[PDB]
Paper text:
One of the few described eukaryotic members of the aβ-PFT family is lysenin, an invertebrate member present in the earthworm Eisenia fetida. Lysenin is present in the coelomic fluid of earthworms and is produced to act defensively against parasitic microorganisms by forming pores in sphingomyelin (SM)-containing membranes. We reveal that lysenin forms pores using nine subunits assembled to form to a large extent a smooth-walled tubular β-barrel structure flanked on the outside by the C-terminal domains.
The homogeneous RL1 nonamer was crystalized and its structure determined at 3.1 Å resolution. Two nonameric oligomers were present in the asymmetric unit, packed in a head-to-head manner. The RL1 nonamer reveals a mushroom-shaped transmembrane pore with a central stem built of a long β-barrel. The height of the pore is ∼11 nm, of which 10 nm belongs to the β-barrel, with the widest dimension of the cap 12.3 nm. The inner surface of the RL1 channel is mostly polar, with negatively charged residues framing the top and the bottom. If mutated residues in RL1 are modelled back to their wild-type counterparts, the inner surface of the channel becomes almost completely negatively charged, thus neatly explaining the reported exclusivity for the passage of cations as well as the inability of the wild-type lysenin pores to translocate DNA.
Residue numbers in the entry:
A (entry chain G): 100 to 148
B (entry chain H): 9 to 66, 73 to 297
C (entry chain I): 9 to 66, 74 to 297
D (entry chain A): 50 to 99
E (entry chain B): 9 to 68, 74 to 297
The structure:
Amino acid sequence: VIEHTITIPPTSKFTRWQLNADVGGAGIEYMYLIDEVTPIGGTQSIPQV
Amino acid sequence: YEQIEVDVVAVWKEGYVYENRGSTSVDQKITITKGMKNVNSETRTVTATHSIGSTISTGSVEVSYSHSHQKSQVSMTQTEVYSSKVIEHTITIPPTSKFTRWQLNADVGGAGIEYMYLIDEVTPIGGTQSIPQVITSRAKIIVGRQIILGKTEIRIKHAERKEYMTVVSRKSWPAATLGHSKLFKFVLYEDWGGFRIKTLNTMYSGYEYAYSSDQGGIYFDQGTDNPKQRWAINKSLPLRHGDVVTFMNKYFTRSGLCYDDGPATNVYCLDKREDKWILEVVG
Amino acid sequence: YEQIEVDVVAVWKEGYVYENRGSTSVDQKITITKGMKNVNSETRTVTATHSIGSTISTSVEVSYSHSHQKSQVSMTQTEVYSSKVIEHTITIPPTSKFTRWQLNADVGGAGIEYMYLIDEVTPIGGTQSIPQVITSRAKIIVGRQIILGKTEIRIKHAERKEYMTVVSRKSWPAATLGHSKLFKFVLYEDWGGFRIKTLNTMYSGYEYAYSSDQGGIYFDQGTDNPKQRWAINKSLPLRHGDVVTFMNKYFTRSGLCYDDGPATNVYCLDKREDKWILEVVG
Amino acid sequence: ETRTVTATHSIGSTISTGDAFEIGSVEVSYSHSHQKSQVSMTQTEVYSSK
Amino acid sequence: YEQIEVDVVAVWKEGYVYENRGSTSVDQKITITKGMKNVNSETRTVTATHSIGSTISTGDSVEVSYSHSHQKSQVSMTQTEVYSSKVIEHTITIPPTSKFTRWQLNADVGGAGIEYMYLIDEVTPIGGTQSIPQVITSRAKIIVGRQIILGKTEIRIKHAERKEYMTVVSRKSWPAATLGHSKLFKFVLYEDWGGFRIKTLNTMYSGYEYAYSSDQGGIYFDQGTDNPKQRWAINKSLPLRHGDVVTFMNKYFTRSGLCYDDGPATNVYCLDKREDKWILEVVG
Ligand SMILES: [Hg+2]
């Protein structure tokens, strides 16, 4: 079980991207979580890879 | 690394409005839960039964005696996998204030990815409500290395099973089956007839293009024009690392590349079936 | 982007009134929950028995038998669950009444609804005001319009979350569900109703979705046939992301749906009418 | 909704004697059954609480 | 806006005593729970079986048998669950050299026919001799419903458990009682020396208006006779008031009372050992 508690300030957006990381050659892999709080607006940046 | 700009288009899925009309504030907590469980069992029973009977016979009198012996053996294997995402938001809604939750489903164009999109706001009561049924916005997407058709070498991974497409020998032909080996490379081609999956690890030279037998099994053939060794993709080009793709057969239009537990191999092409595959560029 | 003004109409569903007449305050916490669980299983049993009997008779009779049963149950289960829990914590002051009204709010024209909750604390006394139905105004931000005859769309099965595609069954083009994002359509209306036209047929001119006499969906040449004509659930305009229903103009009881048939899985069956999402292509 | 389908195959046989002098007889039976069974279940739950 | 003064008699049901003899204090939490759950299911099964069989034999030996069966089964289930809880939780700090006592009694309010749970907690120093209440009488003022004047005030009759109203329909060309959602079916109650009578105001056959029990149990509406079959005994003392929970026992068939049962075409009956609860509501 993994739990994250964050305080989101007003007029802000929260981002969670979950990637699966593949370590090359080693043949191992891990879960990769990216959390971010930014102000509302701008241009969204999404990591596909 | 390259970046492409797209529109994200989010569509309303659900809503909620709450009004606190009083002069004391209120503490609101919303918990949203989604989860899944998968159970598989195999139960093997064996019973052995022995019976010895007899009848003594001669009005008329009959006498019967009977004896039963049953031995039984049940072997059970159950296996469970579960997951849950729980998501909770707690807010203090001030007096004479109105809280709105809108939940939309956001589709990222081109990327073939989607995400849940929640908009919360507290405002004073009054004005008129603004509901977003459909929202368009812009996004930069950090994208994978491009799969150059004909050139770049890739692995094909079954999405659900997390095993790779491997070449083995069935009926004296090279044939597709799922395995753990990271050694089986491929290259993808497009022509007038569709897409072609070429293996670089065939045990019979020249027999390298993936194709469907009239039975469904995937074999690897020599290069012909036959639509049986051609395939329809699910996406628009370019293909990139990590892309979730589908291969529908160009001749057997009803059917696509899937996993089935067949007699010898386990990669087939069957009506109403198209499992997702993950393409990954080798280093 | 366009934005339409509309009335939202909410009708009373449920209510609750709490009076704290005491001279100490009370901490009240109302907590509401709705949830779903869907369970699916397939159980395969294979069972094999061999018996050898024997009787010697003359009188006296003597029997002996032996059986060997070998059985194999294979079951696989799928569970999918969800819930929404809403908690509210308030301090009701001394000599105060708390009232909660729960309404169901229908947004006109848009075909979407939401839960509307009204909490209020006031002094004890006055006349209770109960909202059985409230109308209010809303501006709704809507999707790009699906212009009939013109704009290219995808048709997605709402429940199965996969797309409507064209494949060959018995040498005609036929509808099946697929993962491909490459199967486009254009919608037409004339005085006979709505028509679904595929831009991805493998046999030219055969492009209008129609119901066979068995129920399967194929694509025909444009005729006047009511069997190739469809009744939607909302009125115009159609927009991106609209949830729609396709009922057949000919077999009036039946509508476009999923069913696991022999070769394809898109059908037109009595009493069934699945929901589809229309997406305007980028 | 629970849907069950069962296919069953049985082959049986008896070898016996009688009026074969020394009065009295021996009988011998043999049978084999294969049964194949598929059950499909759909369950849906809806719950609430205040 | 009528109010009547009366005694409530509360009677001991359960007790508990705690002594803290130490010189540090203690934090005590009593927590009591009552609940119910009702489960209702319906399971419909349909099995179709085909069997094809055969035997090849010799006479004047060897026998050879073969059979095949195909069996199709369809099981449909509907389950209904409904539940409730009440939890009462008390937290107290008992100081040192202190005794805590809890008495639970059950209070019966006289005349009104309502009851409530009555809890008495007390912390005192250890010593003295205990006072235990077995039964306590106290006075109370009851704010009561608008009165049902017999012969005059129009009332409706609600099944307490099912929350549906007694309505009048036509069964076998007679006015018959059935349960239904209509707030349109009004009644008026009468008492004479024979007992109590239910008169409908919504009969479709004029004059056939007083509730009676047929020889099979069903509730019909007859002309006003002297027949004890159209008379009923109530559970409460007079007067009847809006919101009163009542019983109707038949004056003729004394073992039987007015109840719900799922019958051939109607569902309001008069059956042995059954007496359903009814709520009486004064119309506007
Ligand atoms: Hg269907």
